[PDB]
């Protein structure tokens, strides 16, 4: 509350650390469904169904331009990528499995770097 603060967690490396994580996601062999925005002209149903599209290259551009106010808003957008994937793709598909695998890969890196 006013004039009552918890001890200051050092957040000075968060930017760099989220950038490293994103690099590691980008270079994963199962990243290919997530690297670029889904083409809304060429994928029937996507524009209507997925209200907030998100992909790795869009997170990179947001990150590099100071559009994440803190590391939680960064995690929210990564999770959005996987939640979108789950909404549109059957679990038993290459893309569906890719999203599961990447969500796991991310959640571990996230816990290991910050928790």
Residue ranges per domain, the chain? 1-115
No. of H helices and E strands in the chain?
A: 5, 0
N-to-C CA span, the chain: 24
Nearest to 78 by CA among 55, 97, 52, 62: 55
Domain 1-115: which CATH number of 1.20.920.10, 2.60.40.10, 3.30.360.10, 1.10.540.10:
1.20.920.10
Dihedral angle of Cα 108, 80, 21, 99, to the nearest 10 degrees: 60
Nearest to 38 by CA among 97, 101, 80: 80
Residue owning tokens 């006013």 = 2
The Cα–Cα gap between 84 and 96 comes to 10
Nearest to 22 by CA among 51, 60, 55, 79: 60
On whether the CB atoms of residues 102 and 34 are closer than 8 A, the answer is yes
On whether the CB atoms of residues 82 and 75 are closer than 8 A, the answer is no
Task: Please provide the size of the chain in residues.
Answer: 115
- The data reach a resolution, in angstroms, of 1.8
The Cα–Cα gap between 11 and 9 comes to 6
Q: State the structure-solving technique.
A: X-ray
């Amino acid at each position: 509350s006013m004039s009552v603060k918890k001890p200051k967690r050092d957040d000075s490396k968060d930017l760099a650390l989220c950038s490293m994580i994103l690099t590691e996601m980008e270079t994963h062999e199962d990243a290919w469904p997530f690297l670029l925005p889904v083409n809304l002209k060429l994928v029937p149903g996507y524009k209507k169904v997925i209200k907030k599209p998100m992909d790795f290259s869009t997170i990179r551009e947001k990150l590099s331009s100071g559009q994440y106010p803190n590391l939680e808003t960064f995690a929210l957008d990564v999770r959005l990528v996987f939640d979108n994937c789950e909404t549109f793709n059957e679990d038993d598909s290459d893309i569906g499995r890719a999203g599961h695998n990447m969500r796991k890969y991310f959640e571990k890196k996230w816990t290991d770097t910050f928790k």
